[PDB]
């Protein structure tokens, strides 16, 4: 189900090539024949508008699109009824006979789950959760628990809903805690780091992603190259260079992951340039990471500017720690940028107290302000010490 949501997401924003939309349309047309995408197929016009979202022959009549395959017709209307009779009408009649004959226990619960998964592809979520809720009481061990969690896990990836999914996934996992192997636990662990990108948790996302394996592929839930970009980009932003040398840049799987596909451009272009402290070619890597990684990915396109703006602030901190002073002529020219471009980035960073530095105008020397023995007891002990005392006085001043 994720293969369609990944390819059709390129239909939303394409600023360069038109063929990217037609190439991604070939994967959509192939999957809609085997499985009915009608809930997401109708969600195409309800997601992003004023591109392809105005083209429909049924609910709303307008023609504006670069893709004519997303509009209903007489063929898809007949196929919608054929898939609805086989996956629901034909299967429910056989399950109804098993209910009266009393055949098995978990077999009827698993049959309701497989039947409930078909309502998700027809576009009716009321009967999908109704048949799933009846089979939830029959779940005891991890045999029927994986299938119940699998249906709710689809709600997050297929319907792109971060609200009612995680609340249900946590309730099912916390009811009976076993986990089976480590891969069945990834469904809760991988979606955890993915949900952190919606509410912008930053370093919290990479907690379970860095320790996760790079060979994990959920197919219909997620692809191989999609999860590879989530752990590479978020893991690089979380762990500092101290932890990058013993984990990211040197790993048995990660070194094998970068050679599989060239669509990462994170653990190779960004990591080596950061480890070698080469700022000449490091700047164009951020543009390739933004265009060819962040934009095509689903959850990596939500932040947008929040990647390059924050990553550029931290890469300067690695340079400020290795020198007391610097050269403004070398930073604003030799690294591939201009003078006005450097003052715009550092202009917003200084008043936010995100770093300690000394910028020179006439002399043109970038000097680092080093606390020496001050460290974390200088401005943090007074701010965090007295700041928490303000929260302590909240309930003590007003009582109840």
């Amino acid at each position: 189900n994720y293969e369609v949501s990944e390819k059709a997401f390129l239909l939303t924003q394409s600023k360069v090539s038109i063929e990217q939309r037609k190439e991604a349309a070939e994967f959509v047309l192939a999957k809609i024949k085997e499985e009915e995408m009608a809930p997401y197929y109708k969600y195409l016009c309800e997601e992003y508008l004023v591109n392809n979202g105005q083209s429909d022959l049924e609910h709303d009549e307008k023609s504006d699109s670069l893709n004519e395959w997303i509009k209903f017709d007489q063929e898809l209307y007949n196929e919608l009824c054929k898939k609805n009779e086989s996956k629901i009408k034909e299967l429910n009649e056989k399950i109804q006979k098993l209910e009266e004959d009393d055949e098995g226990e978990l077999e009827q619960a698993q049959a309701w789950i497989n039947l409930g998964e078909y309502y998700a592809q027809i576009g009716d979520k009321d009967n999908a959760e109704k048949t799933l809720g009846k089979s939830l009481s029959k779940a005891i061990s991890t045999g029927a628990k994986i299938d119940v969690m699998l249906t709710i896990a689809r709600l997050g990836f297929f319907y792109n809903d971060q609200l009612y999914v995680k609340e249900k996934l946590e309730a099912v996992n916390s009811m009976i805690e076993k986990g089976g192997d480590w891969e069945r636990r990834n469904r809760y662990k991988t979606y955890y780091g993915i949900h952190c990108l919606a509410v912008r948790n930053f370093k919290e996302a990479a907690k379970l992603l860095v320790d996760s394996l790079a060979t994990f592929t959920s197919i219909e839930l997620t692809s191989y190259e999609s999860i590879a970009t989530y752990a590479s980009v978020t893991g690089l932003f979380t762990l500092e260079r101290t932890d990058l040398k013993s984990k990211v840049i040197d790993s048995p799987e990660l070194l094998s992951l970068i050679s599989t596909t060239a669509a990462l451009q994170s653990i190779s272009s960004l990591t080596i340039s950061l480890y070698a402290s080469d700022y000449a070619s490091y700047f164009p890597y951020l543009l390739e990471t933004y265009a060819n990684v962040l934009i095509p990915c689903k959850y990596l396109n939500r932040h947008a500017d929040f990647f390059v703006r924050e990553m550029r602030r931290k890469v300067y901190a690695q340079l400020l720690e290795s020198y007391k002073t610097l050269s403004l002529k070398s930073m604003a020219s030799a690294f591939g940028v201009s003078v006005a471009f450097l003052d715009n980035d550092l202009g917003k960073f200084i008043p936010n107290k995100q770093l300690n530095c000394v910028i020179d105008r006439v002399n043109g020397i970038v000097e680092t302000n080093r606390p020496d023995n001050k460290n974390a007891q200088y401005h943090l002990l007074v701010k965090q010490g007295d700041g928490l005392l303000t929260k302590l006085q909240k309930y003590g001043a007003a009582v109840r």
Binding site: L381, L389, L392, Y395, G396
Partner: protein, 98 residues
């Protein structure tokens, strides 16, 4: 056995001040008694922000670190005051219903 039969800062400053008063009388009386060997021993102790000016800068930095520990321990004692205030209400709530 002594403790069974019997069942600070101000005193330290009083005897320390009297040490200079008693020493001053010993020098004046010895001055008129002669008219240097005895006064030489007292001069050895008397001579050995005058000499601490070099360590005065490092002393204030250590006094602040001491206050850091005292500030944290003071907050711990302040949390028990709010905890006991809420606990005192639980006793009052039982007196109203009963």
């Amino acid at each position: 056995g002594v403790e069974h039969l019997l069942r600070i800062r101000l005193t330290n400053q009083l005897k320390s001040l009297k040490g200079l008063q008693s020493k001053l009388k010993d020098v004046v009386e010895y001055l008129d008694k002669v008219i240097h060997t005895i006064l030489g021993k007292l001069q050895d102790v008397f001579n050995l922000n005058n000499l601490q000016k070099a360590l005065t800068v490092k002393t204030n930095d250590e006094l602040m670190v001491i206050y850091i520990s005292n500030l944290v321990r003071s907050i711990i004692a302040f949390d028990d005051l709010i905890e006991n205030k809420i606990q005192n209400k639980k006793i009052q709530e039982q007196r109203v219903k009963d």
